[PDB]
Amino acid sequence: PMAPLQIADHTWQIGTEDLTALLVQTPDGAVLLDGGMPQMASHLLDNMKARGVTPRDLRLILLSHAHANHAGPVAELKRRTGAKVAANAESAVLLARGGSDDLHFGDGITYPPANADRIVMDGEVITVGGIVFTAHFMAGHTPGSTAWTWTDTRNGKPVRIAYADSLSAPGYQLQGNPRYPHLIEDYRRSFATVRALPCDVLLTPHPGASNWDYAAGARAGAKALTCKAYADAAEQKFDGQLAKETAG
Amino acid sequence: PMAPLQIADHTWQIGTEDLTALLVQTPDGAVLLDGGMPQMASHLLDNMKARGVTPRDLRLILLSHAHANHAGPVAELKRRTGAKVAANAESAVLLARGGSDDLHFGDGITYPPANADRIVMDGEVITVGGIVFTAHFMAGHTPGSTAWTWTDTRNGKPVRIAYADSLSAPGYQLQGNPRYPHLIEDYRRSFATVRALPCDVLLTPHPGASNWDYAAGARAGAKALTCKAYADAAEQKFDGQLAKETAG
Amino acid sequence: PMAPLQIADHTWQIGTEDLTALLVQTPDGAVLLDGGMPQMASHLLDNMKARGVTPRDLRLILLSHAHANHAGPVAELKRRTGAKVAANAESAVLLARGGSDDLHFGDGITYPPANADRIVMDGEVITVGGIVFTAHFMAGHTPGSTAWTWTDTRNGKPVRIAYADSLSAPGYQLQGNPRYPHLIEDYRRSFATVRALPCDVLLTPHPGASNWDYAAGARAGAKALTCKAYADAAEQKFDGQLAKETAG
Amino acid sequence: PMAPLQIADHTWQIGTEDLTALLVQTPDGAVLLDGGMPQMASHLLDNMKARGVTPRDLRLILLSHAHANHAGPVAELKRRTGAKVAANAESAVLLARGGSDDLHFGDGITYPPANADRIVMDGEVITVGGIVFTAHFMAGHTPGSTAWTWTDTRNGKPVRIAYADSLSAPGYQLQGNPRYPHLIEDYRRSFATVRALPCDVLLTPHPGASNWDYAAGARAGAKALTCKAYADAAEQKFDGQLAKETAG
Ligand SMILES: [Zn+2]
Numbered sequence: 001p002m003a004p005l006q007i008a009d010h011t012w013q014i015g016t017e018d019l020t021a022l023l024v025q026t027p028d029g030a031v032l033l034d035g036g037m038p039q040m041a042s043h044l045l046d047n048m049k050a051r052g053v054t055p056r057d058l059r060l061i062l063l064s065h066a067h068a069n070h071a072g073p074v075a076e077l078k079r080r081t082g083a084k085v086a087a088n089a090e091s092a093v094l095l096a097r098g099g100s101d102d103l104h105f106g107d108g109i110t111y112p113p114a115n116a117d118r119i120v121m122d123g124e125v126i127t128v129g130g131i132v133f134t135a136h137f138m139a140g141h142t143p144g145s146t147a148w149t150w151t152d153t154r155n156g157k158p159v160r161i162a163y164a165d166s167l168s169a170p171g172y173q174l175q176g177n178p179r180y181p182h183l184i185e186d187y188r189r190s191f192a193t194v195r196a197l198p199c200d201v202l203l204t205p206h207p208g209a210s211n212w213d214y215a216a217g218a219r220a221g222a223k224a225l226t227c228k229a230y231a232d233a234a235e236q237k238f239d240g241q242l243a244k245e246t247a248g
Numbered sequence: 249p250m251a252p253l254q255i256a257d258h259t260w261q262i263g264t265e266d267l268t269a270l271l272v273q274t275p276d277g278a279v280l281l282d283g284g285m286p287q288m289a290s291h292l293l294d295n296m297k298a299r300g301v302t303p304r305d306l307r308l309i310l311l312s313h314a315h316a317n318h319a320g321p322v323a324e325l326k327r328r329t330g331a332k333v334a335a336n337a338e339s340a341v342l343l344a345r346g347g348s349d350d351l352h353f354g355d356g357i358t359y360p361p362a363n364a365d366r367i368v369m370d371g372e373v374i375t376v377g378g379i380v381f382t383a384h385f386m387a388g389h390t391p392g393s394t395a396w397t398w399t400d401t402r403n404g405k406p407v408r409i410a411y412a413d414s415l416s417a418p419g420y421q422l423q424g425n426p427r428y429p430h431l432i433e434d435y436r437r438s439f440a441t442v443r444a445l446p447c448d449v450l451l452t453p454h455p456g457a458s459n460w461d462y463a464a465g466a467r468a469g470a471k472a473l474t475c476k477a478y479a480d481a482a483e484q485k486f487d488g489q490l491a492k493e494t495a496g
Numbered sequence: 497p498m499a500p501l502q503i504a505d506h507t508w509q510i511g512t513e514d515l516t517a518l519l520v521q522t523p524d525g526a527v528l529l530d531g532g533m534p535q536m537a538s539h540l541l542d543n544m545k546a547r548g549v550t551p552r553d554l555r556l557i558l559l560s561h562a563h564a565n566h567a568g569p570v571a572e573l574k575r576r577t578g579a580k581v582a583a584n585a586e587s588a589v590l591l592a593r594g595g596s597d598d599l600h601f602g603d604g605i606t607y608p609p610a611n612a613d614r615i616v617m618d619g620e621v622i623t624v625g626g627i628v629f630t631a632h633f634m635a636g637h638t639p640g641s642t643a644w645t646w647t648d649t650r651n652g653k654p655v656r657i658a659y660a661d662s663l664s665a666p667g668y669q670l671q672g673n674p675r676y677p678h679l680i681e682d683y684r685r686s687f688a689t690v691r692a693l694p695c696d697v698l699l700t701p702h703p704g705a706s707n708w709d710y711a712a713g714a715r716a717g718a719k720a721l722t723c724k725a726y727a728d729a730a731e732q733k734f735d736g737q738l739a740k741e742t743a744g
Numbered sequence: 745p746m747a748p749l750q751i752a753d754h755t756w757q758i759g760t761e762d763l764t765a766l767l768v769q770t771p772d773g774a775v776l777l778d779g780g781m782p783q784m785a786s787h788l789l790d791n792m793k794a795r796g797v798t799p800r801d802l803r804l805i806l807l808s809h810a811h812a813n814h815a816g817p818v819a820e821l822k823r824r825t826g827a828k829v830a831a832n833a834e835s836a837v838l839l840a841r842g843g844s845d846d847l848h849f850g851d852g853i854t855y856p857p858a859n860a861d862r863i864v865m866d867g868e869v870i871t872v873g874g875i876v877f878t879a880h881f882m883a884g885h886t887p888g889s890t891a892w893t894w895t896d897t898r899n900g901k902p903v904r905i906a907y908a909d910s911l912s913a914p915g916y917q918l919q920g921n922p923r924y925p926h927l928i929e930d931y932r933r934s935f936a937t938v939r940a941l942p943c944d945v946l947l948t949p950h951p952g953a954s955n956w957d958y959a960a961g962a963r964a965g966a967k968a969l970t971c972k973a974y975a976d977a978a979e980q981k982f983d984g985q986l987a988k989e990t991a992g
């Protein structure tokens with residue numbers, strides 16, 4: 001449960017030390033990318049207030065994916081701020097039933113449900129205060145898993161920021177999943193997708209994945225990974241769950 | 249986990265010893281009034297299968313009120329049976345946001361969200377194979393709190409059976425409650441209603457309030473109270489909570 | 497189809513000459529009350545800009561009732577603006593299903609559905625920029641039918657503004673209606689509700705019911721009935737309808 | 745207003761000349777595919793009676809895509825029968841908003857909204873009475889466009905039927921469409937998908953697009969294209985629509 005952490009000029013890390021919750025400050029208003037656990041709600045705004053943003057200053061909420069530890073407070077944040085939610089149809093029906101009936105977890109990770117305001121399509125752009133957010137679909141971890149890119153600045157120099165959802169598969173049945181018949185082929189597109197993302201700075205729903213150390217302060221992003229690296233790691237791990245899995 | 253327990257020719261208590269779950273067997277389908285806690289879906293069906301009812305058999309699902317311990321498994325149930333859900337507007341909206349944003353409890357007693365299939369109005373009857381269920385709104389415990397009544401036959405003779413919702417108010421602010429300006433006003437009107445219900449037998453979400461010993465055989469409904477008595481003991485505690493409210 | 501019509505110092509009519517839609521401007525943002533027909537999203541939006549209110553400025557949307565000729569463009573207004581919708585449970589479920597499955601009209605008037613962001617109980621107050629709006633439930637025309645009250649100033653001289661919903665029953669089955677078993681007792685108390693509203697200035701969804709003439713510019717609401725007169729006039733019309741239905 | 749039209753042993757066209765509604769009767773309940781125009785609910789139910797399928801015998805509703813002239817009466821059906829709907833994320837959201845905020849038609853084509861009871865992934869199979877229905881996503885005409893393939897038993901002999909959704913882009917802006925950046929990419933993949941469908945018999949939302957003739961009765965589907973032909977024909981038109989588009 002950290003305090004505001006500058007990543008680039010208009011991008012800050014506002015979610016705890018082991019849970020990315022990105023704040024992108026635009027004149028036209030603020031933007032929240034993920035929000036952590038259902039309980040991290042007021043904390044989120046706290047960092048908002050000190051950051052200069054107030055509830056009515058919250059314009060938009062984007063998600064990496066609609067699970068409880070990453071979209072937990074979306075509903076509470078909407079009630080308490082000026083937030084509207086933009087998500088793909090997949091993230092949207094899932095956000096909407098509170099993470100319930102999860103392809104792989106069922107009801108083991110339900111949060112309170114929220115309604116989406118906008119339905120975005122793969123490669124759709126969202127401009128907030130002259131700041132353009134591009135959506136990159138990467139089905140795998142969830143059918144609606146998404147990647148968000150945007151160019152910020154550091155030294156005045158343009159910095160392309162890729163917010164990549166997990167490429168992980170926490171104990172999933174990959175081959176012949178009747179609930180997700182083409183899981184493997186989706187995940188494989190997703191690896192190559194992240195792999196080619198306009199990436200100067202990468203961040204991930206879990207900071208460990210990108211090698212980020214939010215506790216390291218000015219060093220929190222010194223050994224941080226590349227988009228390519230994290231991709232290939234994630235694949236080595238999947239082909240490693242897919243190998244062992246084959247027989248038995 | 250208990251075994252079914254006849255109450256009338258076709259009414260059975262398939263819940264637990266501490267959570268009512270009234271199963272009603274009609275020729276052209278079977279009704280379920282409340283289903284207790286969310287984790288009680290297997291048992292609910294378990295109890296149904298062991299009573300001459302498959303998933304294909306659950307035709308209807310009515311509820312006393314949209315709280316976790318009384319409507320928790322309805323989402324799961326629909327997904328596993330051909331069950332439809334009939335409920336009033338107020339319960340329907342609450343069912344749909346998973347028990348979140350509770351007037352009195354907030355997100356403290358959340359559960360998987362479900363969509364109502366039918367919206368019913370005060371005094372509306374639902375007939376499933378010749379059995380008439382008449383809806384009695386009794387706002388208070390929740391805005392949508394209802395009393396479901398129907399005639400059965402015990403030993404082959406008519407038994408008018410009232411499934412009155414909780415008239416309780418665990419930890420509520422009664423007056424000056426901005427989220428429920430007319431609370432006291434509604435609670436009073438409900439007692440008068442709960443008291444004038446066509447009452448031969450009285451069943452309630454929590455067996456205690458009606459005075460029912462579920463795990464005590466056919467002598468379970470021996471110390472069970474009347475409608476009148478239940479609302480009487482209901483107003484008494486309220487008027488004393490309203491009185492204990494001038495303090496704080 | 498007209499240009500903005502001022503009612504009070506910060507309260508304008510912006511719909512059409514046959515359809516009411518009120519813009520209430522406050523130091524914290526605009527508040528809209530009904531919107532007319534689905535096709536009117538752009539007109540209303542013109543007027544608001546004419547009035548110095550930009551889309552970002554619309555923050556709240558209130559409704560008399562969720563019929564197509566009054567709640568029509570609400571869904572698009574939500575997409576085109578950051579406004580949020582507040583409504584009671586009945587009006588929230590009827591709005592969410594675009595008007596379909598009407599208790600009396602069925603599916604003959606559907607419009608783009610929408611989600612209420614906030615559900616409100618009877619007598620609940622909402623404050624926008626120091627101004628307070630109070631919801632008065634007046635069930636009948638629709639079971640969600642709401643009267644909205646606030647006070648402005650017509651001469652730097654406080655006027656009580658009452659926006660009350662229709663009290664009509666256009667071809668409604670009154671007594672014996674299975675979709676509305678208690679229609680008669682709701683209307684009745686609804687009359688007695690409208691009658692006693694704080695009401696210097698009265699407005700109705702249909703100008704033609706509270707004797708307004710949006711063309712009359714300077715006067716217009718000068719031969720306009722009072723709340724007592726409206727209320728009384730409806731039950732008169734109402735008590736005429738029942739009479740017929742009964743013996744006739 | 746056409747009487748049922750036998751397509752195979754247990755597959756009928758119960759719609760109209762111009763629009764395709766398929767009834768697949770199975771040991772365990774009947775399945776329906778598309779319903780046509782919003783007002784077509786009673787006609788279907790009538791045709792369903794003329795085939796021994798009572799409202800309670802309707803179990804599952806499937807969809808090509810959630811446009812008005814194909815999914816129009818799905819909500820009245822769900823209300824008048826014990827039928828449930830299975831659909832993908834894309835379709836389920838468009839259906840949940842009545843065909844409003846269309847990516848290409850906006851809100852000019854609106855119908856009663858309906859909730860999905862089940863969400864399917866690409867290539868997910870749904871069995872009803874031993875009969876297996878497989879979903880093939882063919883994103884294009886709508887993002888949620890789907891093709892359903894089942895195998896009947898014509899005259900004791902199985903048959904491989906293919907209900908492929910429209911593959912048209914009527915008036916669509918194909919290149920650089922803000923709401924649909926990967927449109928063209930999506931279609932190409934969808935042309936491929938239709939081409940290779942298990943396809944003895946091919947049927948389409950609009951009969952003519954697969955050159956059926958519902959007035960031709962027994963003839964009806966005699967000079968009717970093959971999946972292979974249909975697809976490539978659709979790709980052909982798409983190529984001309986594209987190139988012609990690039991030249992302003
Ligand atoms: Zn996750």
Ligand SMILES: [Zn+2]
Nearest residue numbers: 069070205206
């Ligand atoms: Zn995670």
Ligand SMILES: [Zn+2]
Nearest residue numbers: 313315389414
């Ligand atoms: Zn409760």
Ligand SMILES: [Zn+2]
Nearest residue numbers: 317318414453
């Ligand atoms: Zn309880």
Ligand SMILES: [Zn+2]
Nearest residue numbers: 561563637662
């Ligand atoms: Zn109306």
Ligand SMILES: [Zn+2]
Nearest residue numbers: 563565701702
């Ligand atoms: Zn009207």
Ligand SMILES: [Zn+2]
Nearest residue numbers: 809811885910
């Ligand atoms: Zn279409």
Ligand SMILES: [Zn+2]
Nearest residue numbers: 811813949950
């Ligand atoms: Zn069509």
